[PDB]
Amino acid sequence: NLNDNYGISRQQAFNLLRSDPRVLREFINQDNPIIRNRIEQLIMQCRL
Amino acid sequence: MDVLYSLSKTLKDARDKIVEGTLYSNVSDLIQQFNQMIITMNGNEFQTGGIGNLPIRNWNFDFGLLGTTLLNLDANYVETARNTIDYFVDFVDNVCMDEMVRESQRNGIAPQSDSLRKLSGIKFKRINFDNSSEYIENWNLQNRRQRTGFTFHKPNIFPYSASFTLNRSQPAHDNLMGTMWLNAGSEIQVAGFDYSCAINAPANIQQFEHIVQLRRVLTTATITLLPDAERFSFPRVINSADGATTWYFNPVILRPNNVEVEFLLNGQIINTYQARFGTIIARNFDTIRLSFQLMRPPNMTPAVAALFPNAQPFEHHATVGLTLRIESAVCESVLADASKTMLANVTSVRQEYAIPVGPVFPPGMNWTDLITNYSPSREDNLQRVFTVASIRSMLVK
Amino acid sequence: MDVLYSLSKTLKDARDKIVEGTLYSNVSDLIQQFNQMIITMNGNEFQTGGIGNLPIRNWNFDFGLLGTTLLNLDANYVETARNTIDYFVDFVDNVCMDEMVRESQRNGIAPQSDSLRKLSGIKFKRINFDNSSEYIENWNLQNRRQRTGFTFHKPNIFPYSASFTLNRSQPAHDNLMGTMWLNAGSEIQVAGFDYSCAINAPANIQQFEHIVQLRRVLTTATITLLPDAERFSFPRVINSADGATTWYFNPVILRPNNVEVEFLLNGQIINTYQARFGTIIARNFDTIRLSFQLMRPPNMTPAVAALFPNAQPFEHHATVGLTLRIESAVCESVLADASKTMLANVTSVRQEYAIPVGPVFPPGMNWTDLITNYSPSREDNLQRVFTVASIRSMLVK
Amino acid sequence: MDVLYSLSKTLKDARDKIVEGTLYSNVSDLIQQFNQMIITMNGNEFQTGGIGNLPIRNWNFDFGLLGTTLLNLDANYVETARNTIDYFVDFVDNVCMDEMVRESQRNGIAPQSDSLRKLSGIKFKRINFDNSSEYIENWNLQNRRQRTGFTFHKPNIFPYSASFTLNRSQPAHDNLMGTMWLNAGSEIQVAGFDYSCAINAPANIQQFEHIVQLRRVLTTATITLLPDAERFSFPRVINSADGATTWYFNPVILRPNNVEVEFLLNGQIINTYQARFGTIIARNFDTIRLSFQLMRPPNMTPAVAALFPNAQPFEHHATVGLTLRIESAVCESVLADASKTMLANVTSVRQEYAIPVGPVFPPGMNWTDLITNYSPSREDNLQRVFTVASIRSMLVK
Amino acid sequence: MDVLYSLSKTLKDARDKIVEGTLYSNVSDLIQQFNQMIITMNGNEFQTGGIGNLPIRNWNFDFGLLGTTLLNLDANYVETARNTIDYFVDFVDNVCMDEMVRESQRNGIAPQSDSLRKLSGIKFKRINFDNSSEYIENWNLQNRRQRTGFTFHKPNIFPYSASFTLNRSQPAHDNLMGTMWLNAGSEIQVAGFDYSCAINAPANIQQFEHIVQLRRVLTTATITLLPDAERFSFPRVINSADGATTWYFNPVILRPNNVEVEFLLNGQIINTYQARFGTIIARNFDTIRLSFQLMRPPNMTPAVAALFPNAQPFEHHATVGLTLRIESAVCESVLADASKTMLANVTSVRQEYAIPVGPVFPPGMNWTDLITNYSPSREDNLQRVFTVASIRSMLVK
Numbered sequence A: 001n002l003n004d005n006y007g008i009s010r011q012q013a014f015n016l017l018r019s020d021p022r023v024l025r026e027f028i029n030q031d032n033p034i035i036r037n038r039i040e041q042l043i044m045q046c047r048l
Numbered sequence B, C, D, E: 001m002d003v004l005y006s007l008s009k010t011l012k013d014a015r016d017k018i019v020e021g022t023l024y025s026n027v028s029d030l031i032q033q034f035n036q037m038i039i040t041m042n043g044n045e046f047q048t049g050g051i052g053n054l055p056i057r058n059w060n061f062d063f064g065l066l067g068t069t070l071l072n073l074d075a076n077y078v079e080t081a082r083n084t085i086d087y088f089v090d091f092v093d094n095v096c097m098d099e100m101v102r103e104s105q106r107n108g109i110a111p112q113s114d115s116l117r118k119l120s121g122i123k124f125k126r127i128n129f130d131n132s133s134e135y136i137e138n139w140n141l142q143n144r145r146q147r148t149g150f151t152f153h154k155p156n157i158f159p160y161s162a163s164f165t166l167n168r169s170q171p172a173h174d175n176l177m178g179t180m181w182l183n184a185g186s187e188i189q190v191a192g193f194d195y196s197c198a199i200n201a202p203a204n205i206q207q208f209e210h211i212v213q214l215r216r217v218l219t220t221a222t223i224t225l226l227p228d229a230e231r232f233s234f235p236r237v238i239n240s241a242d243g244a245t246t247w248y249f250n251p252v253i254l255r256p257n258n259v260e261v262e263f264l265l266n267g268q269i270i271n272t273y274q275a276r277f278g279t280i281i282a283r284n285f286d287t288i289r290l291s292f293q294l295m296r297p298p299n300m301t302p303a304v305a306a307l308f309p310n311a312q313p314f315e316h317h318a319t320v321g322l323t324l325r326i327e328s329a330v331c332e333s334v335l336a337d338a339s340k341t342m343l344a345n346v347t348s349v350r351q352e353y354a355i356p357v358g359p360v361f362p363p364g365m366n367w368t369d370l371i372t373n374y375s376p377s378r379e380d381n382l383q384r385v386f387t388v389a390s391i392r393s394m395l396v397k
């Protein structure tokens, strides 16, 4: 969903897999679309 | 651009009117046009693709003409032709797609791709022909700066909006008064609720109002207006305005009283309808205003009287509503609707080729976001991009 | 009349096929037709308008024919042409509108305006051509007397009607039995309710029936039939039949039992469907009859049993319903539907120019009123007026 | 086959462009094509009918041709022509109908009738011409083994299905958890209910899911997704899974939590949307998966708290839902939709002539049955039969 | 229209380059152009005026030309020329003024007056020439549907707005918190005040924010941003929000903390500056958002500590502010600014001739009202009217 309505450089992508800190931090910090749910949702999940 | 158009109607009226049999005379006028093309092309060289996951492809031209000789058409004639068409088809597809992805702020109207920029060149203009395809028809009329116009079934003018406004509320949310609605696409549903059933209201009547401002004017609209908002006629547990808690809505529906729909244009009432349900015409408007009231029933059978006590708790919540649907309308600006595949074509090509988000369109060509902030740049780009999608659909679906 | 038609397809196929760059021969057959016109015209003078707020403008003709500069047109060629077209466009618009407002009881199927009456003259017939626009196509076939026919999406055949019929009632309205419905456009929703849940009914089954008589026969109809009437599935406070008080409806929904839909033509069953939900075809009918029953559940869990006591008060009202929607159909008479702009065009032109109410059409071209009393005169005038609207939309939207 | 097509566009473009007055040089290219036909025909004998209540009318050919002289057309010219057309019309009708009823397990994609089988003959091919009618356009592209494609507003992809699945139930049906839905046409409504309001559920959240597998892939789909399932928002008395008793459903609606819609193709996610209501694009999919949750409200006002006790009886049943509608889409296979009359035409001709049930199509051309078991044979026969219906509608509606 | 333009540059470059003495070969290219005019005119009659207090002067043409001959110009030559110019000057003036008052809802972008409508005629086009005057330059580029653009020193984008918003208040108005501002022209001043000096605020910091939405996008803006709002740095007695009483504001100024200015375009941040005072560039925006905070001083000398007690009465009111001025910018739409006389010219001609209020412009051409509701019609009329004012100022100031 991210790759389409958007446009993930081969460079980035290759990081967004290794779950790199940076490249991930960027988006969530910069952009703000989707990414900010996949993340957040997790927080909401560690509800215990 | 117009150039582009032709290229297709050429092929369509081609892959269509050229078949094993028919008389030359029915295509004589056509054949010509065709050849004329090949010529202008041959010698020239192109390049498409290069962005995102889109393949880069180069194309050259060096083709023979057409036998303007024969009387009838023999199978062999076709096959030697179809072979030439297929290269152009597979071409145009790549041409369209390549220009159907690029966006631009400054000049988001003119061509972008190396492929098309080259076409607007003068030396190719020798190909225009038969512009009866509704979209190109309007593309031109806009260049000459004149009155355009398209046709839509269940247009998509309302950005999704589902919310409420509590005009009277308190922490317990046990005696509320306000409205809740859903504006989406071509439809509006709005309900006005008063937990007290206008027990202390002047004339035992509570007034409601719902205003919707269109981002573009719609003319010639055929509209269905019906009493009641089914969407807001059932029990709900809703989040409070501040998100801190949840309230209970337990509706009981009464007929909306003194219904008045106004279709305004720049603040002026263009059309007004008083309690008229069914099919109504709104000929030119940029705003819809729905006013309706809840009137406490002056006479109540015991069963009804029991729902509306003089004092709290108010357990049955009096609700009145309206439903309005724009079946068809004309707009001077391109819009998504329930029948045309333009938005879906553009969105689909971009998604399939992993096209990166650009500077003009919202991520994913999101309709709600697009129509909410429908800037001139987004509209010019949308029209360019929709017109190309329509050119493409003449050959590739 | 047919005359009129041409005038447009002439201009369209003109403002379309005539562009900077097309080979002459792609318009040879066309150019001709065009000139032919100019000739027949020049000399004669016209009067349009002269009613309500509609302006009285005078048109006069004095034009030079069309050159033929060989081998694809040069820009200059176009502009000198477009200048001539624009006078005809602005003309026709005024011609259409002028004949799109006049009505006539006696002969409201023929030309009214001084403008058109003059066109039906013989000396003009020399223009007619390419009658492929669905509407004119049917206009002709009718003048000769034959099987006409149009195509509509969500046809507007049902005049708005929202009411109920209490088959068993009493002053307190605490044990009612009857039906309530909404017929509007192409949709019907009907619910049958029995406050007693057929406790004393033979076989513990209450029969219901809803009959809808179309004002015109529909053929080839694709219809969606679904169980339940969502519109009548929520709590309501309704006015009594005499308007003297209000009753309470608190539905609980059960599946409609022994559903039978009959599409009749002149009293004869043409199509019948027993409990078939989803998509069904009704090939020719002027009446729809929906029969369905409420059957008291023979076995009930405690929660269910609690809703249906052996004695009053009856607090949960057993309700069964059906929803029927005509997605598409063909009608031999013009009708409004959810896609065509004809009704909206006619209604809009009349509203914009403050055209006074006439002797044929209901105030505001009100659809419900029109279809409720769809007399031969209203239909002939509607068809004339719809055909003109369609001619106009080929050039002006 | 293609042959057949022509026969019509011949007549249409004929009964249309041949009117009292028009200039000859507008039909020169046409006239020809016409004559060419008469020739090829004359000297041939045909026979249609013979099945069920379908008459067996016989035909012969022996006709004179048409003048070529005359600047313009004189009334007399027409009438002597129209007389010849009417025999062909009344002919084709009988030809279409005769091949529109027969079905063949084997080659349900090839011609059937004695009438048509004879047309596919080579000596008739000399008549083909102007294949631009959307359907034939696609008939060819397929016969050549290539990529087809059609257009549909509110396609009919979902066979009617209205049911439920109880994930937690007990004899009394007083504490259920599960889903109920309605898949029909182009729409899906699904509700997830939990009588306990997730009181003992992990994170006080109950997960729901609804999967719908299309029988054919849809591309380029424009879809409306809205929260809530109005159809399942009202009180119901429903039959138990085993049909032995009835349970009570008394919903109270909460917003669906963590909504995720996935459009999959062969198990792969092609499009995914998280809580996005309004208009969304699904570019290529054969499956839709809707996942949503009911989350017990962490904060509740007294009125809300009262609906959800810590212990049974559970009298208000927490429900969350979704509504999804496919407004438009493209399919490589023919389908019924809300605008095209093909299915209705085929079904209607068969019903009118009392055509016996055959080996391919379900009784009554029932759409649900057809799409549920949409075998290759049914699709090839459906396409043949739909293409013929479209050829017929060019002349007879 | 463009026609009009020429008429002037003709006269200017005339009343300028034609003086006693100059060498002919400096005007050879000019002289010509001139004569060409006289010709096209002679034989034409005009009429201007007729509205309000505007005289109705009539004009005719019948003039001799100019010897081309002579190495140099002799006094006599001039005077016989100047006499002819003066009739055209006094003419154009009357022409401009006549079209500078009429407004049209419909086509407020097209010519109005009987005088000009006649000029757009084709037979006059033979006069166009040298379009380099910034305004006409942009008039063309727009008529062709392209990217316009203008230049303004201290543009007038903000409608006058001077108000406040109390985020915390009470009847006595002795412990308020909120903002007050002045948006006018190209400047914004905004102050955030907190009577309590954030004594009970989280982190002893009170956040403020001021958002200003432009009616048109400004690009290429050079902006001065300075801390403090001098306008709100002095003691004031202000009316309460409800107008029922007056409150006292006794500011003491502190530096704005965490200043952040965002220039957004359609919700997106295009430029952002953190605490940067002085000159900053905002390249493309339709919204300005100023966020700033008041942070209670963590360390205070006795004199300071004395101003901010732990308990009321709060007698010195902590205030932080910002001042933003748009020195220059480019806008695609015409606007009033601090250097151009267009608005003043149009407003002045209308006032002098007692022109009645029309349907488009607010009474008195009021700038605030105009920019507040800057509709497309007002903009098209404003541009037409501004372009004419600029044509007039080339000759008459």
Ligand SMILES: [Zn+2]
Binding pocket: B154, B338, C154, C338, D154, D338
């Ligand atoms: Zn529809």
Ligand SMILES: [Zn+2]
Binding pocket: E154, E338
């Ligand atoms: Zn200055």
